[PDB]
């Protein structure tokens, strides 16, 4: 036995906070967490304990340390079938990554509606509040490879596979309510422009390069989603703290055959929260797996990601009642005009067992709809329908990708399709065609109906000539970017200006920067002037006189477009760094930990080395990480208890820890002699809003800190951070 | 409902003779036939009855007859996801066929040893007579594509997958005891030479072309297997009536670590039997699926193919005691020197459900051995070990081919291998490496032992320099071809001569024919002179004076090498054509069918049209096929009962049916007025005749059937125009 | 669409890092040639003054829109232009290398200092005036093709020699030894260093339980672990690291004499490495630092040279 | 895509056009063509938008579909005229 006698190799199969135990495959960490889909995967789960090591043919291996050779210092022999099988499997482990959204993190969970939506849709999964639908969700970036970093500036994907009783429904959305382009024909052009440049394959996970901004400057339809990407929306704190959107207008079809237009939404029950750029970029270096880790650990801790499914509903007769085209995916539907109606809740409560088998091999596709839903003529959605089926044939090695365990429906599936690479199903039907008499025509077609009926498309009227033509109704590019801009808080506006300024500063060809500034002048002159100033560009008199675009149906703002204008902060699942010293005041620590625990806020005990430290009362304190090992970037706030402050007062890493957290607008709390640290962050003796200070870490101290954490960041500090060298 | 009210669409789920019912997937035809492997495939079997038609995502389809269009006469829309899924699946159905042995037919069965072989091997599947091992067997040709014909002249493959309690063991053999080449390095050269020529991809399923005979003429090591291919061995009657061989010398390893050399054999319990060349070639045209059909229908009828596994055993100390090298795969071990010891029986008793899923996707590989077995340095076997794993990566789309249901072991399999295309298994092990402490090092290595131990190679002594050199002991090419030749009956010798003569007549470049005749002169002068005569070639004085090769260990023949020298005929499962007339003598028919039933011989009632005919007593006789629809090529014997012979006496197809059967040496039985047919077939040997069909008449016919063919008829068949 | 001042086009002359936009090699340095670079001319495709086409050679009129039934209508299945374009896009990716997936490459040439005919009959080492084109790829080991350059890892240093008597590939690393002794253990070692199976963390890092578990249980790994933990694991540039073949190979001369050999690459720019904090922060600020530095050094005329 | 192993089947010699072919498509299994275009997208300024679209015309023009009238509902229905 190679395991330690104390059993410390095995994580506790119960919820534990981040860092308390080693992470583990979901069925081992949470064996009692189940759903219909998770149970259905049992047939393909492979254990390991108490089993002999074998070849793939079931032959027991005696020596897994050596190749077969002619003498102990001789040549390796071709007859070593064990070596060749092992090396062959290894040599062929890789599969192509997804063209886009290659970097992603996934979890299992469930969905249930609040009430029956039978009135507006015949979709079975929305028919009954007590009907639970298992889900598998993958969150992703867009540009970067599967080995790229999480906290890049990008759009995020939010894909949900619903295992319904009437088929798989895939909700393939993003974290912004619009896309960059209007027609699917341009998707390869846009994606090639944002992706690493062809000659040298630089830059990874970044849109800050010439080709991207060249395309944007030449295709003003991109400006709306570019605004969202340049905002703090482009750098979420967690997959748990971002919104989700289907983007396209789809249709709901009820039993009577009535069509209602719908746009899909996911509301994060943990609230909306994003990083700041310097922190996000640094985090790509310090922990490129930050989001993947945070998701896995939140689930292991019982801080289950929860989202509310919502619908914006528009009657068929209201198709033309807005200033924009409902079928235009570069346009959002302001919630002030069409509210989001609450539909149901999704909870992600179990991690996969094997990332490759379940996450990498998962195939989501927006064409996977069910009776009660339908498409629209949105020309971006239209092209997506072709792409997803197509790409899966090479990525997943054939037309039998639905047989890969994660992708299988939990409901019945029977048809006349046969063969294809890696065919798992063994069909016993004497017939492989229909109509047939030899099997009495089974499996049989099913007429459409209110429940358990066959799929029939909504009989939408089509009138026109065969044309490759953009609708003139889609030819408006500045009003939605402006509405977004005006809906942001002043600090959110600053962050957008900084986003554009940083990105355009990386564009080598100055004329591209000038062309982008010209586009900004068509959106808002304050925005354009601020970006121009940072680039050492002067707006022309013509540019200064560009008439602003129209308001959107009389709206000059919609606060639902801001991350922070309307407080929705929730501290459960957040994390605090506690900076230890070699003689911690145990009374401070007791108060700190008790208060954090009560609000579901985790703590990580940090020091200048690993191991343990002893508190003033003899309590042995285990160290989670070093100041360098777990930087402030990875936490939401920092607390420094009293004790022997002299131990850490001159520690460069401890001082920098506070300077970084300060620069990144995080709440900081200093108890007793820890207030000596106010000098490194230039806090006046009188104090400052966002710095919690007291003689000890009492109830009032912790309440103040937790109130600041509910507000996420100390925006009032922004004017003060420029002076700090961090 | 589209099914007929009488239920005649559905085959009876019970054993029925060939042609009596439509054929069906195995688990519908024989639902109660089971074994551990067949049961383990239940998790992936999909039914159909009473289910709704869906997409692969489980969405019910309302209209599976139409694409989605803008108007009933409009363009098809890109949003039709149902159409695109259906067409996409269809568009991607095909996978690469096998490089060689692409044409094959398979079935499920079981194996059981007669006694424990614990004394000579620790292989678990041979440890106890009560130990039943499920098998999956695939029979094949070599050259032809998956769409080529069955009854070509070729070597046949005979591959057995044993689902053992200690791992999959694949016995990947052929129907001849040797191979064409000595070293695996030449395999692509040989195969390229026999395969269709590169410029034009001709000919299919035929070695009768210039490149094959060019290679043979330049590589005399090929001559032994060429002799077998030119003989009637190259055209088996059925996969049930051919021998099987592992070819290579392998090793058996016992619990004490003793190695015994072994060569594997399969003895057909239905006996050895082959077609004649004209019949075989014409059958490739009339029924290119003849062997596949015969196998499937024998199983459906309960005429289960049975084979006895046998071992030729040679002690390690006897490695050098023969005139040939044991490691040379172009050399056979004469049974007169080393007998075949009976080991066990294999029964094939169930067809697959889906040919593609189970047969096409099956992967056999000779490197798939188990503890108790080992390899030798045979340089052909050595290279095979590399090839099979390799080819399966592209043919079956990745390294997870063992996860394709037919290929899955029935015993446990656990290791640290992960990922790869179409990964099915979801590993829960916290570790994907060893040694590990995080999972207490599981799954763990197992030391070798008497039972349930890990695999350890036999510690064979290796001494020598790193050389790409053929052993001088392999440099003898004519003695085994001569042994084979001398062991054949005179009619078998004639068929060999005719095989070479026909093949070389299709070689365009005359010098290649001359070079092959020169090789034959090194084997036997009678053989060489007979082939030369047929090619209009004269042997030179030098050729006439070539000293014949040496005997093989003093043997000038071994009857075990002949198909027919030692009768081993079995009539069960054979088929007789009964040629009907519009007023059959019912008394003749009763006697015929009763006698055939008693011996398990099947009958097919033939006429000039389909439907029914009425006998002299009013009995309604259903017609199975027409004279043209089911030619004599497809049957073993022909019976013509009495009645209104005038109805068929002038029927060209009926007359030709008998002339073809006559030419092809098949037994023919004529009752009463049917004897009028003797004149039209120019007449002799193996013609049963009497006033009526009875005990005597049928006994005579069945005696002829046990002998397979009427060899005595050969001397004057050349003259018959058929 | 190009600016009238021509600022879109880089100068086809050596320029320092950041002075001009980077460009494809054949456009940046058109007069830099070798036998291999010339032999690739048959497959180089230009673009200027050519019409935009399908892969079948059909000129495209409108590359901005799908074919639809009306300007607000559904997309038609008969749009073969859209489907070809999207199909090619959908199938762009190929599997990355199991190991050394992250790598940066350049063309160059090799020339010996003297004939080595006395110790080897290898043609490319037979004459100091025999120039052998090369293609070199430098890499990390663990990380994906989208991972960062300045990780702590071993670096690959692979050279393809296009010899007159065949391709010789000298596939080495930047340390003189490997972690393991027998190839049978390669999947175990690589699985241990790679992201852990359950959650696929961490990327480009050996700082995790399974790696150190394996190391602790397999002391043969300790020598290369020492090199990886040293500043050798964080090179400043691919130009400032050593290369090694690791294995003992043989040289065979015309007389058939065998000499044992171990291969080395000496950086003529010297040996230099980053410091850990700098390296880790650089993975964040510029994950393409080494790839960029290599490309820009070549564009500047600071050609990487190795002995 | 599966028969010929990828999207570059037009590069297999027998399939290659004899006329010019230039576009912004890149990569794919067994990619033969080495593209030198600084741009892999359009519209682009970095390569003055080359290769460029061509208007339809009498000779050497770009492909444009005939503007056939479309009238009807989205249906999975066989025309009665086919019956
Ligand atoms: C509303 C705009 C869009 C959204 C919200 C969207 C979203 C996504 C998401 C979330 C994924 C990741 C799902 C997964 O893990 O498999 C993805 C994958 C993909 N998308 Fe999109 N997408 C959009 C438009 C497009 C378009 C226009 C195309 C192509 C014409 C496209 C082609 C693909 C392909 C080829 C993949 C990889 C597919 C797979 O391998 O599973 N997407 N998309
Ligand atoms: C004694 C000599 C040989 C015999 C009896 C033999 C027999 C067979 C048989 C029966 C099969 C088809 C099995 C099936 O899939 O149903 C086959 C397949 C094949 N053989 Fe052999 N073979 C011989 C030598 C060789 C050699 C020397 C090579 C290469 C070194 C070779 C390479 C292959 C390959 C690549 C296939 C296809 C394997 C596959 O795709 O499943 N064979 N062989
Ligand atoms: C001294 C030890 C080793 C060295 C120096 C070495 C070096 C390298 C390098 C530099 C590359 C990347 C070449 C490129 O730029 O594409 C590479 C790739 C690879 N190595 Fe090794 N390697 C070592 C050991 C191993 C072992 C023991 C194996 C397998 C049993 C192995 C299997 C591979 C494979 C499969 C790849 C990917 C090959 C490919 O995908 O082109 N390597 N190795």
Residue numbers in the entry:
A (entry chain A): 28 to 753
B (entry chain C): 28 to 710, 715 to 753
C (entry chain B): 29 to 335
D (entry chain D): 420 to 502
Quoted passage from the original study:
Here, we present a new pipeline, SIMBAD (Sequence-Independent Molecular replacement Based on Available Databases), which can be used for both contaminant and brute-force approaches. In this section, we present three cases in which SIMBAD has been used to determine a difficult-to-solve case owing to the unwitting crystallization of a contaminant. All cases involve the crystallization of a known contaminant. Although the targets were ultimately of low importance for the structural insights that they provided, their solution prevented further misdirected effort on the part of the researchers involved.
Protein A was produced in E. coli TOP10F′ cells, overexpressed as a recombinant fusion with a 6×His tag and purified by successive metal-affinity and size-exclusion chromatography steps. Mass spectrometry (4800 MALDI-TOF/TOF, Abi Sciex) confirmed the anticipated identity of the purified target protein. Crystals were thereafter obtained by vapour diffusion after three months of incubation at 19°C in 600 nl drops composed of a 1:1 mixture of protein and reservoir solutions in a sitting-drop setup with 90 µl reservoir solution [0.085 M Na HEPES pH 7.5, 17%(w/v) PEG 4000, 15%(v/v) glycerol, 8.5%(v/v) 2-propanol or 0.1 M HEPES pH 7.0, 20%(w/v) PEG 6000, 1.0 M lithium chloride] in the reservoir. The crystals grew in space group P1, with unit-cell parameters a = 69.34, b = 90.14, c = 114.76 Å, α = 107.10, β = 105.60, γ = 95.98°, and diffracted X-rays to 2.93 Å resolution. Initial phasing attempts failed using molecular replacement (MR) with models displaying 20–30% sequence identity to our target (the best hits available in the PDB) as search probes. Ab initio/MR phasing strategies such as ARCIMBOLDO also proved to be unsuccessful, likely owing to limited resolution. We decided to optimize the crystallization conditions with the aim of obtaining crystals that diffracted X-rays to higher resolution, as well as to apply experimental phasing methods. Similar crystals did grow in the optimization plates after three-month incubations from 2 µl hanging drops with 1 ml reservoir solution in the reservoir, indicating that crystallogenesis was reproducible, even though new protein batches were used. Mass spectrometry with a Quadrupole-Orbitrap hybrid mass spectrometer (Q-Exactive Plus, Thermo) revealed that the E. coli catalase HPII was present in an ∼1:40 ratio relative to our target in the protein samples employed for crystallization. Even though catalase HPII is a known contaminant that is prone to crystallize, the P1 crystal lattice had not previously been reported, escaping a PDB-wide search as demonstrated by the SIMBAD lattice-parameter search.
